């Protein structure tokens, strides 16, 4: 695995000094509007998204090697960011048509890669909703739209981040049981897929294989996988590509994020860190929104400061640096 | 308790034959949008808020006394509704500062009673959050304004319905054992204040005096009342106001809204109907969104029908008609 040496320095700027991803995620747009809107039955105002993604990037960046933000409402938040952290910039229209099964990719009408690059990105995520066990002819049109993306990033000699998130085409809720006995084949599969050089992604942004809330000890209720399935999920997802990968969070809370990474680790991934999102901030929203921006700043200076603190210290005992799957040529 | 000849026959076109309030809500605006969004990731368009609201009108108004809807997205729906079924509008702008306690009215700056009656309403709800024990200038506000609603419609001559959803300035979390323990004074003290001749109000829409998951039998943690204190919250309600007065559901479950009813009534509380609005068609959002419109039809027809008709069997042997608190002069 070989990548240019300016791809290399801007991965670099992302990473922290041991070449491990320990990234903060805040790209959020229509979700962060809905998690404000409770808190007071009208929408929030553009300045109100804004300057919560300032807070946290400002207070909070000092703590991450990067920050993944939307152009929407996050290009302040990437003004404001601490000078060691990297920046990854969105390049995704969010969301789907809930109507059809398809979940089709589709780009932020005023961008391309150089005008990302341009506004300052370090790297470019792009995320793609995919079922490998889908619509073969939809599958090739987002074959090709990712084909598209490579491309451009290879262009501007910039590094190309993939996220994807899963689904079925035939089950609607990804939390259910239902889904969580596809969801190995889903994410693991998927990574074989875009792990082909012609996609030309440079880190995949993943889920972990399993529903940790249905592992056996883990489980409250119905028991999915034992301990050792799980486990064995875990070393199929490392053995699906060579590229470097990082988890999402998908917003579980921090205690269960951090108990995933360890249990990552002991099973035997060598995963290369996290864009971690809600798990680190979520407690925020609600102090926004009530409390107001200097109460907000001093959750992110106790509560948020705590969970990316002890996201760090997990970090350092279980992430693997991605150093060791890549080279410069 | 007396009302002018018009009053009186407007309230009746918004009740059954039996002069109970069976009435279904659907004027949710932003709670609409965020509730439709979940299923996709991105906001729904107009006219899907509006055709939702028709589908619900058209299939459940045959159903119900009436239906209340809002003038932003609900005049489609307004005229899909059954014949036999009258008419309320909302004439609040929704929600508040959640970074103030004061929850100030505004109506909603293009109408005036005079126009929701032009435009077909038959009664108008006006939506106050009210905390007794809050800043006294402030209540003041409120009282003046809304002594402006009931001017109004005298000069009108249209039904007033007040709705008070309570509050306490120092608890954030309506749902909390802590808010449970002053909701029985928040909710009838309101009454008491509202039901004085000078707001010229003729109903009173009004939460249940208890949080019944706090009520004992009811409660699978902490027990907040004993039954016989729950009952006697209710039969507190019901002296605290001579007014007609409906319950609202609060968005609890088709089950537990049927339950409180049935409470309600053998407590001795002599309520008077029902605006029953995500009780009844909650379920029909996802179905909207995923599998489409006659899909929804088709939940509405079957679960949204099963939903409201159980609703107005426990509304036959538990509501009290208006029609005994009430006569024209
Ligand atoms: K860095
Ligand atoms: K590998
Ligand atoms: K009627
Ligand atoms: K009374």
């Given at each position: ?102 979940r ?24 793609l909703y995919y079922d490998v066990d889908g619509?073969?002819?939809?599958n090739?049109?987002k ?21 994807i998130l899963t689904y079925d085409e035939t089950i609607?809720n990804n939390?259910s049981?239902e889904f969580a006995k596809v969801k190995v084949h889903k994410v693991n599969d998927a990574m074989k897929v875009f ?9 995949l942004?993943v889920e972990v294989p399993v529903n ?12 999915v ?8 999920a875990?070393?199929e997802q490392?053995?699906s ?9 998908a ?79």
């Open positions: 695995m070989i990548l240019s040496q300016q791809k290399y320095n801007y991965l670099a700027k992302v990473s922290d000094s041991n070449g491990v991803i320990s990234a903060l995620a805040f790209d959020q747009r229509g979700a962060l509007k809905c998690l404000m809107a409770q808190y007071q039955m009208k929408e929030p105002t553009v300045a109100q998204m804004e300057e919560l993604k300032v807070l946290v990037s400002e207070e909070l960046t000092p703590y991450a090697s990067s920050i993944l933000l939307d152009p929407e409402y996050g290009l302040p938040a990437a003004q404001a960011r601490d000078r060691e952290a990297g920046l990854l910039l969105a390049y995704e229209k969010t969301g789907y048509d809930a109507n059809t099964t398809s089709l990719p589709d780009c932020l009408v005023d961008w391309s890669i150089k005008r990302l690059k341009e506004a300052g990105a370090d790297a470019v995520k792009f995320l619509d073969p002819q939809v090739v049109q074959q090709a739209y990712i084909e598209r993306i490579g491309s451009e990033c290879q262009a501007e000699d910039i590094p190309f981040f993939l996220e609607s939390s049981v792990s082909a050089e012609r996609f030309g992604i440079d880190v942004k940790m809330v249905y592992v056996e000890g883990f489980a409250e209720g119905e028991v996988y034992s301990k050792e399935e799980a486990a064995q875990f070393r490392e053995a590509t060579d590229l470097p990968y990082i988890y999402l969070s917003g579980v809370s921090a205690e269960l994020f951090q108990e995933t990474l360890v249990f990552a680790h002991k099973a035997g991934a060598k995963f290369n860190g996290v864009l971690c999102g809600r798990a680190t901030w979520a407690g925020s929203v609600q102090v926004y929104m009530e409390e107001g921006k200097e109460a907000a700043r001093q959750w992110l200076r106790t509560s948020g400061l705590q969970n990316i603190n002890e996201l760090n210290k997990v970090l350092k005992t279980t992430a693997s640096p991605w150093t060791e799957k890549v080279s410069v040529g």
